C-alpha cells in the first residue's frame, strides 16, 4: 500500500533525473541472465523506463529462457557473454592490477573475469555500465564479495545493509541489516552516517538512535558500544541529532523520549535506527514484516563507491523491482556528484 | 487482545473454585506506589488475589486516601520489622547467604527491605506470590527473588512476553534477564517457554532464532543449531528447530517451500532469541511500530510465584502481571499438593 | 600509641585557631548508630568538628536519650527529604548519572539514602566532610562517595593504614579498594600515600612490595618495578624503589648488605602492595599477631574529605576517622583557597 | 622461642635412639661456606647429623682450618667428579631429563654442580637429606632438588614457615614456591601443612585466607572457598574453613561472634595463602615489625628430605633448617621401611 | 627419478592384472585444459585408468583436435546437467549440506560445477577417483572434495610430498592444508604418511620436526613431543619420534652420537612439520637449490580417492598425480572388499 | 664453496695490513676443547687472530702437549679468577644486571664462568671478539653474550647462515635466535642481513618468505608483507619484497613469468624467515639432503664481535666462525673510530 506510494514516488524521481540528462536511462547489469525472478521483473522494469538492462550469459540460453517463460518486452534487450566482450582482456588486466598483492595471479584473474558477478562489477567500475543487481541465487556474502573487491568502498565508508520501514506518513531507516555481524562503536557511527545521507536524499532531517537493551546506561558491553558510537557520530557530523544508548521504543516514540529522558538530544522521535549486531537487526525487521502488519522494503547496499545492490535469495519479484529502482537512483546521484 | 486477559481471569476463578473459593495471597513490596494502588482497585473486584501491601500503614493509608480509592480500605498491610516472623526470616536469609558475604547484621538490614521481605514471605508460605519492581530497575528487583526464592532444578531465570494475534499467540524469550545465553541456556529457556504454552493446551513449536537459515556457521548460527539439538534431546516429543530466521520461523508457508526437511511444521509459537539485544529490540519494535498487542514480561524458572514489573509499567500492565502471578501460584500450589 | 591521636587532635586545634575558631562540618549518615553517637560524645568535647546527623529528628533524639548521652541534645540533625536543597540535590545527582542508568525518579529515591545525601552535602558545600559505613559493607558505603564527590584529577581511591611504632609510623596502601592495581595505579597510590606522610613533616620513603628483590621478572615483579619507575618520573625528588621484598623494605640493614644500589635509604615508611590479598592479610596479621597498633583505614584520592568506617569498627576507630576527616577537610579548605 | 628448637632436638635424639643411635647423613653443597661451617660446629655437638661437605678437600680443609673450628676436622668431604658413583649419577640424571633438553654432556656439566650432586646423592640413598642454596637465589637452588628428587605422588613443592608464639605456633604456606596456586593446589598445600602439624601432636585447624569473609565472590574468594571444600573432602576429620580474612582466621573470638556457622572453632594454626605475593609479604612483615620468632622456610612435598636456605639466613637459621631436615629424613625413612 | 613413476605404474598394472584387468575410473573436471589433455595423451598409452572428462562435448572435442592429440578421440565426456544421475546428485548434495547453509536451488547451481560433480561422481561410485584444480587455487579446489567426499573416521586432510633420493625416498607432510596443526592433528598426519610408506614395503620411520632436540619446551617443542606420544599410543608398532631437529631426523649419525635414547633408528623417511610455513618453505627450497627430485603434493585423509593439482602444475605433475590417484583408488576398493 | 672461506681470509689480511698488521684478539672460553685447539692450529698459521684461551694454564698446556700441536705452545692463556681485572669485571656485570635479579655474589659466581668472562673481556676492550659454546646449547651460550655485550641501537640478535652456491650465495636469517619475529623484527633482521651482503660488495635483494605468493592474508602472509613494507621505508634503495614463496624468491624466472609487478628482479640473496621452525628446518634440510655447502650460523646484531658455535660443529666449522669473528671485529673497529 504505502510501498506502492513509495516505489511510485521513487520511479517518478527516476524519470525526473532521466530528464535533465537528455532522456538517457541508466545501464544496469544483471549477472543472472537466466534467473526466473530476474527476467519476470525485467518485464515490469522496461515499461517503467527505469533502466537499460544488460543480461550476462550466453545469448542462446537467455533467449531460450526468455522464450520459455513467455515474456514479450525482452526481445531487444542487450545481452553479453563475459569472455566474449571487446573489453574483456583489459578488465582482466585491471583486476590483476587491483588484487595482485591479495593473492590473485594473472590466470586466476581471467578465470574470475569469466564469472558474471566479477564481470558485472568490473563493468560498473570501468564505466561501461552504471549499476548492478546480483545475488538472487547465491548467498549475500558470496554475492557482495566481487562488488567489494572490484568496486570497493569510498574513504571511511563501510559496506552496510539498509532497510526501509514504510509507515502511513513517514518512513524509518534500519541499518545494518546484512553485512557486519558485530560492528564496533567506530563502525556503528559510520553506518549511522551512511543511513543519514540516504535520509537527506529524500529531503528529510535525519534523526539517529543507537539502539541497545538499555536506556542511557553505558554499562560495559553493548550499552557502552552504542553510547560511544553516538559520541563518535556527533563528533564526525555536529549538525545532526545522534543519540544512544537507548531502547527502541524510546527511539521511535517522541513522547517516551520527552517524558523520561528530557536531557536527550534526540527530539521528535528517530527515523534512523542503528543496531548493535546482525542478530538484532535481521530479526527485528523480519518480525516487523511478519507480525506487525507493516511495510518493509530493502535491503539496499550502502558504503560502496559505485551503484550496486545485492538481492536476497528469498527475494520476491517486486523485491527485484524495488532493488533495481534504488540501484538506478543511486547510479544517477553518483553521476551528479562526479560532475561536481 | 483484551479477550486473552479476560480468559485468564476466568481460569483463575476456575482454579479458585475447586479450591474452596480461596484466592492466592500476592504481596506487593511497593505499598506506597501510585500505580500499584490504582491497579489494586481493579484487582480485588475481579477476585484475583488477597493483596498484601508492605510499608508503614500510616504512609500507605495516606497514599491510599490521597489518590481517593474506596475499595481498598481493609486490605492487608504489613511492615516487615513488626511482623511476628521477622526475626525467623532473618535467620533463614542468614542461613541462605552466610557463605555469600552476608553477616547477621546485613541480613537484618536486608530483611527490612520490602523486596527481600516479600520474597521471604513467598519462600516461607506466608504468601503465595509477589509482584515487585515498579520503582527500581529489573536487575535490582529480580535479585532478592533469585537469592531468596531461587531457581528450580535445571532452571534459568528468563523473561517471557506474549505477542497476541487475533487467532493465536506467540511467546518471546528471553526478553529481560540473560545478556548472551549459551546453547545450553537457550535450550532451557526454550523448554520453560514450551511449558507455559502447554498450560494453555497449545502444542509448543519452538524456533531458535538467528540471522541465518540452517547455516550452522560459526557464531550465533552454530549456537542456535546446538540449542535446538540440546532441547530436542531433552524433550523428543516437541517440535524444536534451528538455526533459522524469524520469517522462516513464524510463516509455515516459507518453511514448507524453502526448508521441507525442517522438523518445525505449522509456524512457531515459541521464539528463542540469541541475545538480549535482539529480543528487547524486537518486541519493543513490534509494539511501537506494529499494531500488535504485547503483554508481559513474565518471569519463568523460579521455584515460587514471583513476577517483576518493568519500571515503565502501565496500570493494566500491573493487572496482567498479577493475573499470571496468581495463575502461576495456583499451578505451583497444585504441583506441590501432588508432591 | 595514643600519642599519635593527641598530636593529630592538637593539629586540628592549630588550624581552627588559625582560621577564626571555626570547626569543619562533618555529616554522619547513620545518625542512630550506637557506636557513632558514643564517639561523638568524645569528639564534641574535643572541639574537633561541627557534627551533622542524618535521620528523622525523633529517632535520633530517642537513641540519644536511650544511650544516656547528655552532650548531644543540641547537635544539628537533618532529615534528607526535608532539607531545602533536597530537590536541587536530586537534580545534581541526576545531572551526574543521567547517562549512567539513573532516571529522575531514581535520583530522588537515592537522594533519600543518607549516604547519597551526605555525599551531596559535601560536594555542594553544605558540609566539609563526611564519615559513613558503620552499618554497610565497604563497597556499598564508598559507592555514593565515588559517584557524587569523585576523585581529583589523575587520582585513584585507595585505603590507607598507619602502623604506629615507637619513633615513627608506616603507611600501608592500598588496603581497601583496588583488587589488583596496575603499575600505573600503584605509582599513583604511592604518590597519594607520600603526600599524607609529607603532611606529618616526615620525608617520604616509598617501597613497592613484591615477592622478589629487584628481579623485574614477568608478573608482579615487573609490575612493581615499573610502578616505581612511573612514580619516580612524576616526582623525581622522592625516594621510591621496587620491586623488593618486605624485609628489604623496612629493614635498612638488609638493604645495606645485599642491595646497596637501591635508592631507598633508611627503611621505608610507605609500603605499596601489589594486590588486595597481600595488603589486607598483611595489616590484619600485624594487628592480631604482634602487639603493634594499626589505625585506619582512611580513604585517599577523593576530591573532598570523606572516610568510610569498617562495619565492625570500634568507637576509637570512629574517633580516628573523624580526626582524619577533620584534618583532611582542613587541608582541602587551605588548598581550595588558592 | 628457643623452646621449639630444643624440643625439636629432643625428638631428633629420640628418633636416633630406637634406631641404633645412628644419625642422618646430610650433604651440604656449599662445603667452603663460612656460615655453614659455623653452624655445623654447633650442629655436631648436638649430634644431629653426619655432615657431608662437597668441594675440593684441600680447599675445604683449609677453610675449616682458617676459621678456627675444632669439631669439624674429621667430617666427611666429597669431591663430586672424584666419587666412585659420579658417572652413574650422570647416567641417572641423563635418564631423567633427556627428553627435557639435557643430553649426556649437559648431564656431565650439571652433575659437577654440587647442588645437583647433592640431590642425586640423596635420591640414590648415598645420603638421607640435603640443605643447599646458602649462596644462590631460591628458585635456582630449589631447581636441582625438584629435577632430581621430585615430588611424591600428588604432592606439590611448597614452602612452610612457623610463627612461634609462647603458647602455640602458626604454620604459613606456601611462602616460597607457588606464585598463584589453583584451588586444588591450595588444598594440597593445606594437606601438606596439616601433616607437619600432626607430627608435633597438635590438632590441625586450617584456614584458607582471602581479603573476604565467606563471600565466595569471583576471584580469589571463590578460589579459596573452593580450595577449602577440596581439602575438606580429602581430610574430613580436620577443621578446614574458608574463604576468610586473617584476623577471622587466627582470632577465635571473632570467628565465634561474627561467623558462628563456621566449622573452624578455636582459632587457626594452618594459614594457607592465595598467592606468593601475600604469603611472602605477610611473613616477612610479621618478622620485621612484630615481636614474633619466625623460622623456616622448610620445603614440603618432595619425595626425600631436602631444604633450601634463604639468602638472608642467619647461622642459627642453618641450625634450624638442618634440625628439620633431620626430622624429615628420619620420618621419611621410617615411612619407607613400613 | 623416473624409476619411481615406473615402479608405481607397474604396481597399477599388477593390481589390475589381479582384479580382472579393469582400470579405475578417474574424472577430470577441467576437460578442456591444455595441460590436462596433454598428460592424458601420455596416460592412455600406459593403461592407468579410464579417463572421464567433464565439459561440453563440443568444446572438448574442439580442443582435442586443436591441440593435435590423436589418441583421445573416444574418451568418455560428460556434461553435468546432462548426466542421468544429475538430479539425484543434486538431491544428495542437498542432503549433506542443508543444515550448512545450502538450499535446494544452491545445490543445483553447485552440482553444475564440474568440481562438485566430479566429487559426487566419486562419492556415489560413478567413478573411483578424480584429479582437479589445475586452474584454481588449492583451497577452492579441495573444498568440494571435503564437502562431498569427506574424511574417513579421525582422518584429517593433509598434503604430502615425496623427496626422491636415489637409494630411498622421504615423505613430507602436511605441505598443503593445515596452517598450524595441533599435536593430535600432527599425530594423525604422521599416521597417514606412515600408511603410504608401508604401502611401498618400506618400514616407516617418522620424525616430528622442530627447531629443538628433545627439549619439549613450551611451544613447538612441547607440541611435537606430545604429537609423537599421541601417535605412538595409537600405533605402538611404528618408529615415531620427536621433538627433534631436522638433521637429527635425517642424519642417523647425528642421532647416534648425540641422542642414543631416541626411538628413531636409521634416519627418518617421514618428516612431519609443525606448521605450513616450515613445510612449504622447506620442500620448495629442497626443490630449487638442493639438486633433489620432489613430486607431489598428493592429498591424504579422504574417504575416496581424489587429488588436487597446484594451479602452477606441470604436465608430468598431472601424470604422477593420476598414477597416485589410481593406486589410491585400487587400494581403497580392496579395503572396501575387506 | 672453499673459495669463499679463502677469499674471506684475504680480507682479514688486507684489513690488518691496513692497520699496522695487528690481528684481532679473539678469546675462546673452551680452552681445553680438542676441536677448538685443533682449529686454532689451522687458524694460527693463517695469521687470522691472536687467540686467548681460558682455563687453568696448567691443564691447557698439558692438553696442547698431549694433543701434540706445536704451533700453540706460546699462545695467550688466562685463568679468569686470576686476572687483575676479574673483580672489576664482576662489578660491571653487577652494574648491568643488578635490577634483573643478580646481586654481587651471583655476579661473582657468573664471572667465574668462562663464557661470561669472555663476554666481559670483549665489552671492556681486553679482547675484540669471542667464539664460544661448542659444548652447550645455543640459548645458554648466547645468553651471556647478550647480557654483557648487548645489542647495538635498534639492532636485534639474529643468526645468519650462508648457502654457498658456485656463482653466488644466499643469506638465510634468522636461523638461531628469534622464535616468532614480529613484522618490525623481521624487517630489522632483513636490514642486518642486507648490511653483511653489502660488506661483500653484492647488491642485496631481500625476499620475505611465507607459504603464500603475494596474498597478504591474515597470519604469516600479512606479517611478511608488512615486514617487507617496513624494511622498504627504512632502506628505500633496496629491493625488498614479500610475502612470497621460497621458489618465487630464489628463482628469477618464476618471479618474471608469474609476478612481473614484483619489485624483486634477478633472484633473491637475502631470505627472511617467518619463524624459527621454518628457518632452522630449512637450512638443515638444505645441508643434509640438498648437499649444498652451507656455513654458519653467525650472530648479527650485537655491539661487539661474538659468535656461538653449534654443538654439532666441525673443526673447519670453528675455523669459519673464527674467520668471520675476526672480520666482524675489524669492521666494528673501523666504525668506532669515526
Numbering used by the authors:
A (entry chain D): 437 to 776
B (entry chain C): 439 to 777
C (entry chain B), D (entry chain A), E (entry chain E), F (entry chain F): 439 to 776
The authors write:
As a control to mitigate any local/biased effects introduced by 3′ loop mutation, we designed a different unbound variant by mutation at the opposite end of the binding site—a N718D mutant repels ligand at the acetyl group. Supportively, N718D protein purifies without bound ligand and is also insensitive to inhibition. We were also able to generate structures for R535E, R535A and N718D PTA domain variants, which demonstrate the same features as the wt PTAapo structure.
Bacterial hybrid malic enzymes (MaeB grouping, multidomain) catalyse the transformation of malate to pyruvate, and are a major contributor to cellular reducing power and carbon flux. Distinct from other malic enzyme subtypes, the hybrid enzymes are regulated by acetyl-CoA, a molecular indicator of the metabolic state of the cell.
